[PDB]
Symmetry: D2
Subunit: 727 residues, 4 copies
């Protein structure tokens, strides 16, 4: 054979390339010299293909992989065709159960490194030296939808990091919001059943907008705090690169002296916080259900590595009861104004997997996977999670040897007396499979706890109380965190929250459920309750109007760190700009546009009404990446329309809609020269409007203005104006 093109254009360059420049490829082929200990240790299972013969799994070369064996060329297929049956058998058995929750996820390899030794507060080996590099495997996910569902749904996001330390695997299994919906793990199946597709008909997918979810929420006020985050734009991240990560639970750090320090884990996105807007998010589930998976993969291939700062909120043991909420209640956050996040290290995701199924689908994370230097707490949600992941992985990954699946393997030594189990890979030579033993001189042997390389010993927390199935009274406060969150949002973030509740409750068929949810909102904030109620045709009662708001959180009436946008944190590197071309584009504009974008690490996509190419005014040939319909504004952060022959596209409905959609979704728009003709479709005054870049040509000042808008993410002042645009 020789089916590849003679020019070699089927194979992507093995160098960092911007989104759309090359076909995407398996990590080890795209970036073969991006290495870490874990990636190198997977080399024993990586399989090539070039220049090898096609064989059965038994190593028998196949001569004809196009036909079954039959009696005559139009005859019946024969049972002795072992090549066909092995091939079909393997195909028939490719699927495994998806994760019970967080089935939809996108993962990548990277590395973590501390900023300084944390030996004063923890003996965790991976935090002991700034020069200790820990390989990591991170999986980002939604929660409700199946593995085949869409990425930009409204949902909580999972953020799971597997740290391959020298003293064991440590999995930090968190989310993108700092609290969970429920307090005790016993109600997990109830909550998850309520949010998941309803049981009779299995609708709806990737949505909490249905009766059962809001039924549960209305009957369980502990849920309201996370519900507030989900209803805000936090529920629709722009990308996994632009969301925060939280471990949620209070855990413990244990140092060499044995002192325990309470800790809550945080991931700060170094690309900053950024979320979509609901219409854009929902439309994006239809135009590209793989948007976040794609964005992560392409950012890594481009060298726009997702970077996160690990941060710790540290609370002395003696300060356990100094807050007006319980530190062990997972529905309560620890305001950063009260307890600041200490910056501890940075994680860089710099390499995509080779095989999604092998490495992403089969990865198994567990919050119970801790190492010496870390310990749990009595958080009743965390307590129940400890049992659950162990249990689900024995059926999901087919047996108790899932730690032998390459991606899950520790990079440090593991030796014990455990044996057998389905698909046992390790062949143990130990004469003994029990301890104590004399026949192998008791090896492998226990190791006392110690400052480094010591065995695991639980912090000796004092336990006193009766065996009870009882919620702590300290957890029975449900409205002050939701109120604190609400008051910390900007006015437009508040408006998006109102709209989130309003949209979701509008899809709840039983009107009494919406009414019960509005009543709960009245216990949080009257303005919030009224705005939602007005959108639902609901009138608050006299009593609802008089519900006294919950108390502030330890004197706080707001905390700007809870807002996505209150404190500027924008980053344009890795963002993408749509450039709407015409058949005789002003080549001087493109040059200035592209040069300015490239200086800020901002990508561009050249769009037209057909594929192929257009020729600029000076003969510069411009290759078209996609059509106006083919790559909608939903996939970009800003839109630039350069000068040239605008009559080519001024009557293009798709071109006009591109701008109306971007406008509606608060995206920066830049119009050069005769591209100002488009001002009429989005009804922009002659004298202009903040958020619309316009000039005689696209020189350097024009580009600076557009890049300034992009750093602020969206044009929030345009909100009141989008009402009157039919898009």
């Amino acid at each position: 054979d020789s089916l590849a093109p003679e020019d070699g254009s089927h194979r992507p360059a093995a160098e960092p390339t911007p989104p759309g420049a090359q076909p995407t490829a398996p990590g080890s082929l795209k970036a073969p010299d991006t290495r870490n200990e874990k990636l190198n240790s997977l080399e024993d299972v990586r399989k090539g293909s070039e220049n090898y013969a096609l064989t059965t799994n038994q190593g028998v070369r196949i001569a004809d992989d196009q036909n079954s064996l039959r009696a005559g060329s139009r005859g019946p297929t024969l049972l002795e065709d072992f090549i066909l049956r092995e091939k079909i058998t393997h195909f028939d058995h490719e699927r495994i159960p998806e994760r019970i929750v967080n089935a939809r996820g996108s993962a990548a390899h990277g590395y973590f490194q501390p900023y300084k030794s944390l030996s004063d507060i923890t003996k965790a080996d991976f935090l002991s030296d700034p020069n200790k590099i820990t390989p990591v495997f991170v999986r980002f996910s939604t929660v409700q939808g199946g593995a085949g569902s869409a990425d930009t749904v409204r949902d909580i996001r999972g953020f799971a990091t597997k740290f391959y330390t020298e003293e064991g695997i440590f999995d930090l299994v968190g989310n993108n919001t700092p609290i969970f919906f429920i307090q005790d793990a016993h109600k997990f199946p109830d909550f998850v059943h309520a949010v998941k597709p309803e049981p009779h008909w299995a609708i709806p997918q990737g949505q909490s907008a249905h009766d059962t979810f809001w039924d549960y929420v209305s009957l369980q006020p502990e849920t309201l705090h996370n519900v507030m985050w989900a209803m805000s734009d936090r529920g629709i991240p722009r990308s996994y690169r632009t969301m925060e990560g939280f471990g949620i639970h209070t855990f413990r750090l244990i140092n060499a002296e044995g002192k325990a320090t309470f800790v809550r884990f945080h991931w700060k996105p170094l690309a900053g916080k950024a979320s979509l807007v609901w219409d854009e998010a929902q439309k994006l589930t239809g135009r590209d259900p793989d948007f976040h998976r794609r964005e992560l993969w392409e950012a890594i291939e481009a060298g726009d590595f997702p970077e996160y700062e690990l941060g710790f909120q540290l609370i002395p043991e003696e300060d356990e009861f100094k807050f007006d909420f319980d530190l062990l209640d997972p529905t309560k956050l620890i305001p950063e104004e009260l307890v600041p996040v200490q910056r501890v290290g940075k994680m860089v995701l710099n390499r995509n997997p080779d095989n999604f199924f092998a490495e992403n689908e089969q990865a198994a994370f567990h919050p119970g996977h801790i190492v010496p230097g870390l310990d749990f707490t009595n958080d009743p949600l965390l307590q129940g999670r400890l049992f659950s992941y162990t249990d689900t992985q024995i059926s999901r990954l087919g047996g108790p040897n899932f730690h032998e699946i390459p991606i899950n393997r520790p990079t440090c030594p593991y030796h014990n007396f455990q044996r057998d189990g389905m698909h046992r890979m390790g062949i143990d030579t130990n004469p003994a499979n029990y301890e104590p033993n004399s026949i192998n001189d008791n090896w492998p042997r226990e190791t006392p706890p110690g400052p480094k390389r010591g065995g695991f010993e639980s912090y000796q927390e004092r336990v006193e109380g009766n065996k009870v199935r009882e919620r702590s009274p300290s957890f029975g406060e449900y409205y002050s965190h939701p109120r604190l969150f609400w008051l910390s949002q900007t006015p437009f973030e508040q408006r998006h929250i109102v709209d989130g509740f309003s949209f979701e409750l509008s899809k709840v068929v039983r009107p009494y459920i919406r009414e019960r949810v509005v009543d709960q909102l009245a216990h949080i904030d009257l303005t919030l309750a009224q705005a939602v109620a007005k959108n639902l045709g609901i009138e608050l009662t006299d009593d609802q109007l008089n519900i006294t708001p919950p108390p502030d959180v330890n004197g706080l009436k707001k905390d700007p760190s809870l807002s996505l946008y209150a404190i500027p944190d924008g980053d344009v590197k890795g963002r993408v700009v749509a450039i709407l071309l015409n058949d005789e584009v002003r080549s001087a504009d493109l040059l200035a546009i592209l040069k300015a974008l490239k200086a800020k690490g901002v990508h561009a996509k050249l769009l037209y009404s057909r594929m192929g190419e257009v020729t600029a005014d000076d003969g510069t040939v411009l290759p078209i990446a996609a059509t106006f319909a083919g790559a909608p504004s939903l996939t970009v952060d800003a839109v630039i329309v350069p000068c040239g022959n605008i009559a080519d596209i001024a009557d293009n409905g798709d071109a006009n809609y591109y701008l109306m959609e971007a406008y509606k979704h608060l995206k920066p728009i830049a119009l050069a020269g005769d591209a100002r003709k488009f001002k009429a479709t989005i009804k922009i005054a002659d004298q202009g409007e903040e958020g619309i870049v316009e000039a005689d040509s696209a020189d350097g000042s024009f580009m600076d203005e557009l890049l300034t808008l992009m750093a602020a993410h969206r044009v929030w002042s345009r909100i009141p104006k989008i009402d009157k645009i039919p898009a």
Copy 2:
């Protein structure tokens, strides 16, 4: 802690040692210098233990592996004990389904080499060069019983050989008898259900001696041939080393020119053919249910490598129809008087596994695993087998990636477009997972058939007929082969066959089934039928006495190759002798006895009425291996009683019974000096008798005479004398 004894007696020497001399151990520790390509390729998964810390599967060191985490030392166990939960979870999931048939099996590693190139008749790479060594993994088995059933049952034995060739895995999955019970694979479940434990109560284990088996046999005369073999001493082999091996089905060899030659595969035991006697075998299932497994392991540890000669019965395509029987009928053997076995190569089993579960229990053999140069035939039993193994292995070994389990992995290259499936180990980097493809230039690619390293192409056999569920009329003959077998046995072998049928039929509760089987036997041979009938208190009718015997098989009235013992082929190396000691043994006898045995590679076990040591007449300290009851005569091939203080053991019931049992089971017995006092125990005349070695001491010809008897295996002439004897 440091529990091993300071003299290092807990660890067996890494050198060949006779059975019982040292504790047995994992193959790689016992014989680290014994290597082969496959054994070397398993190094990546072998796990050590010495000097390593005890950890969880995630690599976390464990400090206290003696206790669960609890609230208070007398308190309740806590759910956060992740160490306890991983350890119990792995334990809980240790078992996998046992094989549906042949669950009880023992295996070992070895190597094969052909005597000469067979390129003229087959292009199979492993048979192309005398200097080409092919690693093998062989598993011997019983058929009916579970994995925890006994070894020395009366049953067919499985003999499966996995050849790790350069062009693919070839599995030769045979039995120890040259025919099978049924003709068509569609009846496999019927036959197997009939022989296995009956469904209401799951009795009996490891036995065909029950109603349903004999019910099925009585209604399906095709089974009679293999039933004759099972009722003979063939069904109770001395060892896996002393039984023949057969592929049963007629397969094809394909040469480079495309010529097909019919072939039946044979394994000749280089240690000769040898079987137990029923009473011994049955009692041995009680005294040592792991006798064959143990014997194999210890032979290999001693350096008594099981060796087998691969041989081929070759039949030209033109002679397909030249016999009285159909070549494709698996209930018919090909008499070696008609078609000789041509010697092909030698297989040596020289290393035990490291871990029984990992290597033995998970090994997967398939008769459909053939390589270029071999092909199938239309044998209807073979045809159905091709489907079955593939299918059963998906549930037994948890998915479609069982070829990735270390023992099953090819040592040659394997590449294809198959992906995923439970427990997927290989991480594919191929951009393509389909063919034809241009994105990876169509690799891996198909390979045309050719003389060497070519793709597999089925022999173009002509097929002509209608789609029918019909047994070929050529297969409808059921008694001539059984008769040929019967007539080829010695008189004592015939008696053992009669005794096997009689015993088994006595366990059939419904008398009419016994009568029906007797009627079938009367179609085979009147002498056989009459002898069995007499033992069952059944009288043959006049019509039964007049059933004309079936015709000879192609003019043959007997074939001595079908007998275990007609043609002497005795080999004493690896056999064992019990030495019954006394408290003042004649040291001179011991010296002569032990050195003579050692010179011929015959092992010995020094037995006494207690453990510890005995002191010979000259001060020699003699370590006792076992007591008379601890290691019964069932486990040895011969018994020697040296001179000394015989009154020490003369009135010892066990010592006397030891000889009665060994005498009853036709084993050579040698008595020196005053040990001749034991002659009255077994009723030996003053003059002596053939099969009893006796003299004033064990000096001159005493050992040579004993070894001559051992070479003949058992003293068949003693059969009439054991008739009485209460033992």
Copy 3:
């Protein structure tokens, strides 16, 4: 073709008969009049056979269950033979993992009833009324050996009783000796690995008589008490009917007023205590490895119902 004898001697009489008098049979056919609430509740899944056509699992009648479909009577088997493939597929997937421990066991149905109300010490409904019967299902077992190992080995015996009570299933999962070898569950895998067949060669089956068991015992003196019981004749019962049963652990009884009482459960064999002697037991593993299973089944068919207090 292949039909029953004319005399009808192929079928066991459906009345109590002594061991060996009739071929043994499924319980519902041997004793159709013996019922209890649980036995009756299993009627939804019991399947008969007499007078019904042989079919695939999809209900398609089979015409020829003796042959595979082939092209010509001496030809290759065809892939379209769906009858053969369903039949072989089901056969190929018959086995399920045996129990990790107590894989060898024999079971029977029965009933329990208290002698008097125990309401003063426990609110458990199955012990509240002497005339309130609770169906049981009991499994007796060995511990070490696989499902196909022998019955009369030297080992501890398991005695598990499932009580189908009106307020839920209550399982009393005990043994035939009143203590266990170890103290903490965390060491269960260590102990069980030590007593099971050794990992390199998987020997020996159904026996503690090997180095790793005694090695562990020698290093863990807490095991000595149950070792004493195992080495005594308790380790080789004559029948499941002639051994004691014990829950081993202290559990609690809770009455309606909330009072807790510590309790240890016992089963007293009404057939008395009886064991084999070692030589006999060991030889019996060879002559009849299914001795206990057979003996239990035949006692029940004979009307010698195993009774325990």
Copy 4:
């Protein structure tokens, strides 16, 4: 077998036939049906060979494949007529 966990997926309620189904197949993971047949094989005399085979016929008969004519060599070849 893998999607539905074993060979007894026909006992899953939605998959169950509404007509009679009787055969000698036994066991398998999650076996619901409790067979009372003394025999789990055929031919058998202990249950008078029930359940029994049924000859093909106009109605309620056993399945018999149409006796289509098969002629040709064992090949892995696409028919030219499909090209």
